[PDB]
Design an enzyme around this catalytic site. Sequence first.
Site, PDB file in Angstrom:
ATOM      1  N   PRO A  40       0.818  -1.213   0.000  1.00  0.00           N
ATOM      2  CA  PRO A  40       0.000   0.000   0.000  1.00  0.00           C
ATOM      3  C   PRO A  40       0.850   1.260   0.000  1.00  0.00           C
ATOM      4  O   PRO A  40       1.986   1.279   0.481  1.00  0.00           O
ATOM      5  CB  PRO A  40      -0.795  -0.123   1.304  1.00  0.00           C
ATOM      6  CG  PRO A  40       0.163  -0.825   2.225  1.00  0.00           C
ATOM      7  CD  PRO A  40       0.979  -1.768   1.357  1.00  0.00           C
ATOM      8  N   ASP A  41       0.284   2.324  -0.567  1.00  0.00           N
ATOM      9  CA  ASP A  41       0.900   3.647  -0.506  1.00  0.00           C
ATOM     10  C   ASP A  41       0.554   4.254   0.847  1.00  0.00           C
ATOM     11  O   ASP A  41      -0.564   4.722   1.062  1.00  0.00           O
ATOM     12  CB  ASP A  41       0.416   4.523  -1.657  1.00  0.00           C
ATOM     13  CG  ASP A  41       1.091   5.888  -1.684  1.00  0.00           C
ATOM     14  OD1 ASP A  41       1.946   6.170  -0.818  1.00  0.00           O
ATOM     15  OD2 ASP A  41       0.756   6.692  -2.581  1.00  0.00           O
ATOM     16  N   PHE A  42       1.526   4.255   1.764  1.00  0.00           N
ATOM     17  CA  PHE A  42       1.299   4.768   3.112  1.00  0.00           C
ATOM     18  C   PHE A  42       0.806   6.211   3.120  1.00  0.00           C
ATOM     19  O   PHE A  42       0.252   6.661   4.131  1.00  0.00           O
ATOM     20  CB  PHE A  42       2.584   4.650   3.934  1.00  0.00           C
ATOM     21  CG  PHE A  42       2.814   3.281   4.507  1.00  0.00           C
ATOM     22  CD1 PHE A  42       3.118   2.210   3.682  1.00  0.00           C
ATOM     23  CD2 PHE A  42       2.728   3.066   5.872  1.00  0.00           C
ATOM     24  CE1 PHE A  42       3.328   0.948   4.208  1.00  0.00           C
ATOM     25  CE2 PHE A  42       2.939   1.808   6.405  1.00  0.00           C
ATOM     26  CZ  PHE A  42       3.240   0.747   5.572  1.00  0.00           C
ATOM     27  N   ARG A  43       0.983   6.943   2.024  1.00  0.00           N
ATOM     28  CA  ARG A  43       0.542   8.325   1.927  1.00  0.00           C
ATOM     29  C   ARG A  43      -0.739   8.488   1.123  1.00  0.00           C
ATOM     30  O   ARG A  43      -1.201   9.619   0.940  1.00  0.00           O
ATOM     31  CB  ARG A  43       1.652   9.176   1.313  1.00  0.00           C
ATOM     32  CG  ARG A  43       2.952   9.052   2.057  1.00  0.00           C
ATOM     33  CD  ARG A  43       4.062   9.752   1.327  1.00  0.00           C
ATOM     34  NE  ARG A  43       5.156  10.086   2.226  1.00  0.00           N
ATOM     35  CZ  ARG A  43       5.208  11.190   2.957  1.00  0.00           C
ATOM     36  NH1 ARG A  43       4.237  12.087   2.922  1.00  0.00           N
ATOM     37  NH2 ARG A  43       6.262  11.401   3.740  1.00  0.00           N
ATOM     38  N   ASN A 107      10.586   4.256  -1.485  1.00  0.00           N
ATOM     39  CA  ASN A 107       9.891   3.118  -0.894  1.00  0.00           C
ATOM     40  C   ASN A 107      10.760   2.417   0.136  1.00  0.00           C
ATOM     41  O   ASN A 107      11.986   2.378   0.021  1.00  0.00           O
ATOM     42  CB  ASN A 107       9.488   2.091  -1.956  1.00  0.00           C
ATOM     43  CG  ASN A 107       8.601   2.674  -3.028  1.00  0.00           C
ATOM     44  OD1 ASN A 107       7.993   3.727  -2.863  1.00  0.00           O
ATOM     45  ND2 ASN A 107       8.531   1.974  -4.153  1.00  0.00           N
ATOM     46  N   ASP A 109       9.961  -0.902   1.021  1.00  0.00           N
ATOM     47  CA  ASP A 109       9.426  -2.260   0.966  1.00  0.00           C
ATOM     48  C   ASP A 109      10.430  -3.333   0.548  1.00  0.00           C
ATOM     49  O   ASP A 109      10.059  -4.513   0.533  1.00  0.00           O
ATOM     50  CB  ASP A 109       8.207  -2.306   0.030  1.00  0.00           C
ATOM     51  CG  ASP A 109       8.505  -1.771  -1.375  1.00  0.00           C
ATOM     52  OD1 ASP A 109       9.614  -2.015  -1.904  1.00  0.00           O
ATOM     53  OD2 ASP A 109       7.596  -1.116  -1.944  1.00  0.00           O
ATOM     54  N   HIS A 126      14.228   7.129   1.893  1.00  0.00           N
ATOM     55  CA  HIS A 126      13.357   7.106   3.058  1.00  0.00           C
ATOM     56  C   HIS A 126      13.665   5.920   3.967  1.00  0.00           C
ATOM     57  O   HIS A 126      12.873   5.591   4.858  1.00  0.00           O
ATOM     58  CB  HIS A 126      11.903   7.118   2.591  1.00  0.00           C
ATOM     59  CG  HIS A 126      11.546   8.355   1.821  1.00  0.00           C
ATOM     60  ND1 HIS A 126      10.449   8.427   0.990  1.00  0.00           N
ATOM     61  CD2 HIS A 126      12.140   9.570   1.765  1.00  0.00           C
ATOM     62  CE1 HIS A 126      10.384   9.633   0.452  1.00  0.00           C
ATOM     63  NE2 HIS A 126      11.393  10.350   0.913  1.00  0.00           N
TER      64      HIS A 126
HETATM   65  C1  LIG Z   1      13.786  15.165   7.324  1.00  0.00           C
HETATM   66  C2  LIG Z   1      12.835  15.261   6.161  1.00  0.00           C
HETATM   67  O1  LIG Z   1      12.983  16.091   5.268  1.00  0.00           O
HETATM   68  N1  LIG Z   1      11.818  14.386   6.161  1.00  0.00           N
HETATM   69  C3  LIG Z   1      10.822  14.342   5.101  1.00  0.00           C
HETATM   70  C4  LIG Z   1      10.265  12.926   4.956  1.00  0.00           C
HETATM   71  C5  LIG Z   1      11.316  11.876   4.647  1.00  0.00           C
HETATM   72  C6  LIG Z   1      10.806  10.452   4.806  1.00  0.00           C
HETATM   73  C7  LIG Z   1       9.462  10.197   4.144  1.00  0.00           C
HETATM   74  N2  LIG Z   1       9.155   8.774   4.096  1.00  0.00           N
HETATM   75  C8  LIG Z   1       8.244   8.257   3.275  1.00  0.00           C
HETATM   76  O2  LIG Z   1       7.562   8.943   2.514  1.00  0.00           O
HETATM   77  C9  LIG Z   1       8.110   6.749   3.325  1.00  0.00           C
HETATM   78  C10 LIG Z   1       6.679   6.248   3.154  1.00  0.00           C
HETATM   79  C11 LIG Z   1       6.617   4.728   3.105  1.00  0.00           C
HETATM   80  S1  LIG Z   1       5.639   6.867   4.514  1.00  0.00           S
HETATM   81  C12 LIG Z   1       6.424   6.363   6.025  1.00  0.00           C
HETATM   82  C13 LIG Z   1       7.087   7.295   6.816  1.00  0.00           C
HETATM   83  C14 LIG Z   1       7.652   6.910   8.021  1.00  0.00           C
HETATM   84  C15 LIG Z   1       7.559   5.594   8.441  1.00  0.00           C
HETATM   85 CL1  LIG Z   1       8.252   5.145   9.968  1.00  0.00          CL
HETATM   86  C16 LIG Z   1       6.897   4.661   7.649  1.00  0.00           C
HETATM   87 CL2  LIG Z   1       6.763   3.003   8.136  1.00  0.00          CL
HETATM   88  C17 LIG Z   1       6.332   5.043   6.448  1.00  0.00           C
HETATM   89  C18 LIG Z   1       9.655  15.291   5.369  1.00  0.00           C
HETATM   90  O3  LIG Z   1       9.215  15.428   6.505  1.00  0.00           O
HETATM   91  N3  LIG Z   1       9.153  15.936   4.308  1.00  0.00           N
HETATM   92  C19 LIG Z   1       7.990  16.802   4.409  1.00  0.00           C
HETATM   93  C20 LIG Z   1       7.081  16.602   3.199  1.00  0.00           C
HETATM   94  N4  LIG Z   1       5.778  16.567   3.426  1.00  0.00           N
HETATM   95  O4  LIG Z   1       7.575  16.489   2.074  1.00  0.00           O
HETATM   96  C21 LIG Z   1       8.366  18.287   4.552  1.00  0.00           C
HETATM   97  C22 LIG Z   1       9.275  18.553   5.736  1.00  0.00           C
HETATM   98  O5  LIG Z   1       8.988  18.728   3.344  1.00  0.00           O
END
Ligand SMILES: CC(=O)N[C@@H](CCCCNC(=O)C[C@@H](C)Sc1ccc(Cl)c(Cl)c1)C(=O)N[C@H](C(N)=O)[C@@H](C)O
Length: 288
Positions: A40-43, A107, A109, A126
């Site tokens: 799944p797309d967690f978002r 991803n 996964d 990520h």
């Molecule tokens: C420091 C920084 O920059 N971190 C960024 C986000 C970076 C990681 C996003 N990981 C994902 O997408 C992976 C997906 C599978 S979801 C997921 C997330 C956590 C866990 Cl633990 C699990 Cl299992 C699943 C950030 O916060 N960006 C913001 C944004 N909305 O773009 C804003 C600040 O710009």
Amino acid sequence: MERLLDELTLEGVARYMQSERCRRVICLVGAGISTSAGIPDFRSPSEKYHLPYPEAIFEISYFKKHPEPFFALAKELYPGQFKPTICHYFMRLLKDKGLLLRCYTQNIDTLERIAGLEQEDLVEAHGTFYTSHCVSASCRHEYPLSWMKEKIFSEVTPKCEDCQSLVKPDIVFFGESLPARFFSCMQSDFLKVDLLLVMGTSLQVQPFASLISKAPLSTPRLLINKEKAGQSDPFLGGMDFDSKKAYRDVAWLGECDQGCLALAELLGWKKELEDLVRREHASIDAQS
Ligand SMILES: CC(=O)N[C@@H](CCCCNC(=O)C[C@@H](C)Sc1ccc(Cl)c(Cl)c1)C(=O)N[C@H](C(N)=O)[C@@H](C)O
Ligand SMILES: [Zn+2]
């Protein structure tokens, strides 16, 4: 014009790929390349964990104090099988053909690794479930995914065998920085790229989305995605597919698997890709 693509179509991209001008391809990929694998797309749109607030289950400070909700959610959403898609194996073919400079993935996964991309080929921007570490800075014992799955299924909170601290999957939780590898590879790779293949991402998560602006101005950029994405936002402020000034960006709109099949077919790779996927899928189905 001086543009590298002879036309702004998938056919134009394939002709460019098989010309001597195109030697180094960077793939940028997101959840759209794994939905056909049942991940799944967690978002994307579409309780018993009793969180103080919904976002806590993905925040690092909360996880360290109460990891059980995350690992309960992990078992619930844990996929019944890890079978990479046609898209993942298309990138393995790029690697085999000597064309893959790097795959940057949003991803977690692990399907890129299962499909045969190696650590050097990947920037897991990520993080990933593929490895986990003891959270104690003086220990940092590494555990493989097989060890973590056993703990999640037996509903035992994973603890380090050396020091009994919590063991966390190498995912970037909120409150954690992206891996230094993301920034170090970006600074080098985009000096060298001939083609950006953007697959299965709507380029909404930063800083990952900003990677498209790191390409040289001449580098063609192909989007394979269910929806057009990456264009400049008429509000906030990019991909230019459709203006009279468009010269290098191409959108193929459909399922990622079908777009990769269509591109492979143009390249003369359809039989190679079918044979690879059927063999790897058979091998995964036959795990005993
Ligand atoms: C420091 C920084 O920059 N971190 C960024 C986000 C970076 C990681 C996003 N990981 C994902 O997408 C992976 C997906 C599978 S979801 C997921 C997330 C956590 C866990 Cl633990 C699990 Cl299992 C699943 C950030 O916060 N960006 C913001 C944004 N909305 O773009 C804003 C600040 O710009
Ligand atoms: Zn430890």
